[PDB]
């Protein structure tokens with residue numbers, strides 16, 4: 001596959017794999033994922 005044209009390897013998420021204009025934003029996005037901690041011994 002002949003790559004048309006490339007430049008600066010943009011950044012993207014690791015959970016949703018979404019690209020962002022600037023990494024700065026990306027890092028902020030990854031947050032949405034990291035939320036409350038439900039996983040636990042709590043059976044009820």
Ligand SMILES: [Zn+2]
Pocket residue numbers: 013014015016017018029030033
């Ligand atoms: Zn994400």
